[PDB]
Amino acid sequence: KKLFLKALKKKFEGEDPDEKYTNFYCFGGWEQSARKKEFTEYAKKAAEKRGGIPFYNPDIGVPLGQRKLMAYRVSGTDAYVEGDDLHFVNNAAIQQMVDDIKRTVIVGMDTAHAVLEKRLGVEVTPETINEYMEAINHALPGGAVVQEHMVEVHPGLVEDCYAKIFTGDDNLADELDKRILIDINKEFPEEQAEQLKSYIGNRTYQVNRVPTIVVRTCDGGTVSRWSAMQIGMSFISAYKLCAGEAAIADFSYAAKHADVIEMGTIMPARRARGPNEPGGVAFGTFADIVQTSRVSDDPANVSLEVIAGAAALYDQVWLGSYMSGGVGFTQYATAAYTDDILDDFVYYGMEYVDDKYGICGTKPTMDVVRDISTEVTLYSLEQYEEYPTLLEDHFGGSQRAAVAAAAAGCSTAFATGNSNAGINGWYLSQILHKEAHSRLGFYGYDLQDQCGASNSLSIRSDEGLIHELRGPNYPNYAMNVGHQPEYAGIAQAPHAARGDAFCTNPLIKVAFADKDLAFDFTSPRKSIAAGALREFMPEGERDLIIPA
Amino acid sequence: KKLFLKALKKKFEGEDPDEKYTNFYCFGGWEQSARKKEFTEYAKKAAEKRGGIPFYNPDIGVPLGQRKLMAYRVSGTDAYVEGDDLHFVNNAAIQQMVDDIKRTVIVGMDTAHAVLEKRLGVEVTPETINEYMEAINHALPGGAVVQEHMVEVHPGLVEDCYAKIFTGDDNLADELDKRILIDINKEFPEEQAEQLKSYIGNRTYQVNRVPTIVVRTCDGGTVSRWSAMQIGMSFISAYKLCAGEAAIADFSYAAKHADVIEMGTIMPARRARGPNEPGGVAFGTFADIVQTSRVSDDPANVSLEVIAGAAALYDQVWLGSYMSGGVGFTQYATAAYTDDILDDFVYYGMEYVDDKYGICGTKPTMDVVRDISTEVTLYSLEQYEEYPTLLEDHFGGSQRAAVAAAAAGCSTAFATGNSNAGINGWYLSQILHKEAHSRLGFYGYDLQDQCGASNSLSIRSDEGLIHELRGPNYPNYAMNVGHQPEYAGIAQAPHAARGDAFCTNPLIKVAFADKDLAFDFTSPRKSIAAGALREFMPEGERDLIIPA
Amino acid sequence: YKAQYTPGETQIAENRRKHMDPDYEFRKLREVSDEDLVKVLGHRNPGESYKSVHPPLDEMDFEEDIVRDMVEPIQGAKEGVRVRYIQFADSMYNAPAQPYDRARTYMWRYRGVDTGTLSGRQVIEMRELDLEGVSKELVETELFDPATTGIRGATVHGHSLRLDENGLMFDALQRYVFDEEKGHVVYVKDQVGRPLDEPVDMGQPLGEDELKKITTIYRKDNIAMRDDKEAIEVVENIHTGRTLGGFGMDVFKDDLRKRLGD
Amino acid sequence: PMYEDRIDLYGADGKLLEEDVPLEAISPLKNPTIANLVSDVKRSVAVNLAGIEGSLRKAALGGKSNFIPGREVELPIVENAEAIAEKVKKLVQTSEDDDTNIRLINNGQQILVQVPTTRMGVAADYTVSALVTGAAVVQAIIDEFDVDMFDANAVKTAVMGRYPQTVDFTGANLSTLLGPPVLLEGLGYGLRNIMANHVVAITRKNTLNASALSSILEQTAMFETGDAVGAFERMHLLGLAYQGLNANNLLFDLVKENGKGTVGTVIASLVERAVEDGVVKVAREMNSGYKVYEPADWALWNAYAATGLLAATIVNVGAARAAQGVASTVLYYNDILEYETGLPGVDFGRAMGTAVGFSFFSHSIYGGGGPGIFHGNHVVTRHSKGFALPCVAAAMCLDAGTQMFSVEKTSGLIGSVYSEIDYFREPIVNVAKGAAEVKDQL
Amino acid sequence: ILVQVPTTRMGVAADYTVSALVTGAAVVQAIIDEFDVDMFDANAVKTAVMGRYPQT
């Protein structure tokens, strides 16, 4: 039975789901909505503060709710909410996810430890490292360690700020303080733990989480710098160095350049941003940030959870605000993580692949890509044709294109273990979709779509790139909604199918295996749902330093 | 009698101000401080939320408060606070100042109106403009105007978001809705209003203030884009255009490129940031953002207020966080706006200049620069020599260098009406300061100091530039504390002396003459002091959408 | 050529010249054993051999470089000894040595020097062997008042503060204490704050009156900068030369003429 | 000639190479060796075949501990380096007769690729050499081993890294002495983008050849930025001649006469020589007896001061055999020189200003690093217009092993690839050759 | 004025920005020399020719 039928039945209560006809213009417009009513009341109360500056007013322009305004089920959850509750501005959980990614940086410690031993004649032991890790959990949130008459940051404002450590060296891990250790053997299933440790080797890393209030006041480019400053201070403190000598410059260079792992890379001038902004986050990097891979062996579920997180990050926040703004792109994104619609299409594709090829059962070929992409696309289109309330749900073509193609692309990757085969399948799905419905998406939806087949397997300059390393700055992808969240899913898809511990970076994967993060990356859907119900507590609020 | 003597007396209560000897090691360390005891208590309570991860701990590293830990008086106010209350993370007023600058963009309306009339055959009247301004005050904060089934932004979260209009056309201004008008004739003294209009002509501009919660979630580069999107939506709505036709692209191009006035420009890759981040804000632009010029005829007062705001923006936030981070640079900055110390030096310089040359009484020559800079520097140095509690106050050389040279530089500008003469005076002060005390600032304080004289009046490639247009990305200036805030003062100084309505851009000056801004830009000192006392209410808090 | 060292017509300027003038021998005011010196430095144990950072120069093989081999390496570099540091705070109340004063002195008088000047501290980084030789001279002579010259590698706050009840400079870590019985300054910690097994007696503070005579800082209640018009004039001359050079159009007028010629 | 200045060119060994040469014969605008050098800098590309092979084998793609499990490709690339190099030649050349040069490095573990000047001539900037070499290596490898279409994009990624998701070639296995212009601090800074350690590795740690190479690139860049235009041109030429090319053996002799000296004694020697040569004269005497000096020739004084600067660097850092003191040396050479004379320091304070920041950022927490990683396109050391970085090159030649970020660690492969190019390795003798070739044509 | 910078200058420069950079410096100095612009006014001429660079 179709996975979306439950949600459709509750969304269109008391309506014949096979019926192509219905009643409109009979809901009282915006007054049908509890949320729109709340908004209007708050708008009124606000007049005095605004000194009469006109504000939110439903009588301006379009009269919303001539049709029935939908609630949405966050897929896999019991959260049924009006769409307004999923807007990133209205959803504290979506905001904290972005801030948690943005405020995280990973720094290798082996170079610094080598500096300590070869240049400063200091011996490094688990005991000195534990001392260092305690020092930096005082320094990182803004406490003084060296100078007299320092003023300091209010700890009540930065309780989310901390530093942890992980190592591929099991003997060292046994000696490190459990309070600040990310234990790879504890957090991951055995086979994943072994795979991670084989790529990490006997290397050691700290994971620094800068305060949320800092990245909100400032930006992503602040983070690696903030981290490096307090890494430096902590080494000076814990190892009793000259507070400013030649060897200190080596720590800085390591922490800022040579041994630092950032979440995202810088943008070109036209869309200029520093590191650790959403545009610089590669699809495979985001997939590794999401932690569903280590608590689930269901490849469809792992991919679906990545897409949910990626939808909020890339379409809602990045494209819907950073690169545009206003009412934005909530429903371009929610189409990919509500009402179990995408779930149905993906689980159909996985079943089809499992039966015909086996999961990771065949080398990628154009024959295999065409077979899977066509079948999954056809099936997805037929669902929208068979269920009128489904079509009324994904009322925008772009939404329907992204969802069908995601299912097509992920399935191709499930079969072949190849992400670029996956996106080649994605582009076939799109142009097939176009011929079937004599429509696709919005005005400029398929720019990358028509460019896509040729560039999917290209080896040229700014065309060829393994999909895992593509991201929002890949030229074809730089502008448009309804792609990037799904590309993250396709980057995840072959590795979930293979049961890989990670997609692109083991250090990133391990760095987010941490319960002390505010956002729960093991299930982006459940956290976003909590934010929709206003049950999620974000970091970085300023209640302690402002009037009541 | 010296202007700083009152504050010194309260800061060092019951102590002989001439005595070169005092008692140390007798205060109980950090427990002498109410703020540090508050910090320690919150840190303890935080253990539970942190699951045992170590946190703020005064026993880590240096034992603060071996000396007496000072309170600071915000200059011109009755606020005496511990320095911690002036840290940008602890001060919601400093945070809101940065956000108010960041979330502001100015857009010309004449080009759009020409598109409406010449390409779309629509007539523009004061009435249609009033309709447009009502539409955008619904659309800018995230309300729908054209599409059915739009979700919207909670108005309670974005009450600080609005659009206003100003025009050099008095007849048009008389017919616009006063609720959304910035009235040049009302906000500026008559002669300043005339000067502004002589540059502006009869042109019309809108000032869009994007929601605080948006720039905190995202960044400065979001703002001109957010503005442009909703300008587009509002024109489409108010003028009943096709919702997506060729002429619409002209609006977008005008609002994003051709007719937009941003606060700051982009950074180079090494310190990459989008528009409207602090590093891109030129000194004369910041001087124009500060509004003291239109409420005060005292040139020293106008410059001093600009320096206070600039200290918070450039040293505390930009250099102290964006470009570094951690405990940061609070007192490098506060030296320039506390205890009326800089005030004394500047008012000494102004009186010296007024008596000998007259305000704007002479052409700039090296003779004049040498005379004023030397005199003011000597006087400022002798104060630190004459008052032991003053030297103990500005205990860091960088602080003392910046404050003395600021007085030297502003005074030079007061006499000559030339900002470049002003900074040339600044650099003379610095190397003179160095010879007198056989010290100057921190390790790398005088990079720009030693390069300064030669590049002050240079005309070459990346050396020559009129000082008003210099900023934090001017190469010599890109790295170091204790310069940029003071440079903003020097940029303001000759224009304050001249009684100019603005320093670099009349449009920016008018755009911040607005009582509905949260931060009071007529007096940065008073707002910062209110933030220090936790009496300032910031925008963008999320209490409405989170648990209690 | 007869070197001038620095401009100025006051005793402060003269004191600076004497510090820089290599033919002027520093007056030795006190005795500090090699062991106590090594102890306060806090880098190594007295009696142990110097540790290397790289092999000795003769055990390494170099390609021919005439220019390099024209420069005599210091002993510590010959032996490949690690680089270490010593760091002072100098009270602004007429400490006998002052930060840029130190740097200019070192670069005239010592070889293979890395020195950093700051308002609150002045540091030397040097081959440890040669560092110890240099450091002895820096603590035994008139360049060192045990009361107003603090040895400190970190937490350096104090140069700008009032002196304590016994006339000693502030030290947040109190690496030295006042011995009331003898009236001596005694180091009980090394320069980074590790407690010493056996404290080191640095002797008596110099008098206020003696410091006023020999200090290298200008102060209004002693000899004001304002009184040294010669020094100010030369500072302005340096500033002016830099300004005109940066502008270039006038000082290079003859160069421009040729570029424009024909 | 435009200018009247004549100079004697001396080699790194202190011996006369070419006598009575007009100043413009060493101008970047006239000297044919400098032209050839700049040309080679722009068109030369280092390809790391072993790196490509290793990256492919592990699917270590995009660098910085990126791995993409399941996308591994196994190819015997280094084993077939000669066949690959020949195909790269065919794809990169414009004719069989052009100046394309391919050379195996480290027995084929690496390759030097020199793109023909014809391609450079119809390109806007210099990125073409990497871009074209990149496309050639990718197609050569795919063609040589018949790589499957679905594996082929891994080869592209292995060669050129994260581009175009990144603005540059992050994690790539090819490189060029110049980085992409999109990472430049300032307009026209291309030739300033070469780390001091690269200069040292390229010149095989020979002191004066390193300072010469750095000076040639810096001063040539000053022509590109328009700083060496009109009034300022002669200053930069004299700077190049004296500080970079040991004109009249002044540099070699200041070091020689101060082999057991200090920064102070180098200054004394320099000031004396300047008075002797009429470069500088007493303007007035002060009450103490202090003599205030003034330049008789401003551009020439700056060149003399700049020469004493490099000499003082060699003497003080050479004495330590530890490079960390170079920043300190550059700073106090100028500081002491100014108060010794009342003259403006090197580059009118900008060399000194640079050294202040250079000192800070090589001894603190806020950024920078060891002295070997600095260059003219660095925010810290960009500020002097050609007169500071040659000291850094010289200093790293003299370091005997005190650095973590040493020449071998940062620049080993780079030295192996480019030091074969004779003009790179021994610029002084070859620039003198170029000067002789054109002195009569001026 | 149309200014076409000699290929000789282009040949020893890394990229094409040299032509604007050199022309800019020539025009700035040409104007200052022709009218004997005061030292304190001269930086206004530079700013008029090359704009906000290098703050931008």
Ligand code: F43
């Ligand atoms: C004015 C444009 C042209 C443009 O540049 N963007 C618009 C409008 C813009 C506005 C609408 C705000 C408002 O109404 O006040 C916003 C929200 C962007 C913003 N400024 O914040 C938006 N669209 Ni549009 N826009 C959407 C969509 C769509 C779909 C709607 C088709 C339908 O049958 O309803 C069509 C494109 C298409 O036909 O494929 C569409 C076009 C259009 N879209 C037409 C208006 C069409 C009309 O007159 O109704 N959007 C969608 O397909 C779903 C996602 C939805 C976005 C909001 C969200 O994600 O929650 C919104 C995304």
Ligand code: F43
């Ligand atoms: C460790 C360094 C080296 C470095 O790269 N930065 C340091 C330390 C850094 C840390 C100190 C944090 C801590 O103690 O935990 C911070 C706050 C930057 C950060 N990471 O957040 C800072 N300095 Ni510092 N730093 C300062 C200053 C100074 C002054 C202090 C001299 C004195 O007598 O106290 C001197 C430089 C000088 O001598 O000119 C100085 C040096 C130093 N500064 C020496 C440590 C000196 C020591 O051992 O005590 N700073 C100042 O001059 C005042 C402003 C003050 C800054 C904090 C603020 O602005 O509120 C702080 C700015």
Ligand SMILES: C[C@@H](OP(=O)(O)O)[C@H](NC(=O)CCCCCCS)C(=O)O
């Ligand atoms: C030099 C550079 O650092 P890197 O050398 O790139 O590590 C630069 N930092 C800074 O300039 C720090 C500026 C603020 C801290 C020092 C204030 S004195 C930056 O992060 O881009």
Ligand SMILES: O=S(=O)(O)CCS
């Ligand atoms: O109608 S357009 O396709 O231009 C934009 C839809 S969001």
Ligand SMILES: O=S(=O)(O)CCS
């Ligand atoms: O001591 S340093 O000058 O390096 C930094 C002072 S904040």
Ligand SMILES: [K+]
């Ligand atoms: K509406």
Ligand SMILES: [K+]
């Ligand atoms: K932000």
Ligand SMILES: [K+]
């Ligand atoms: K502490």
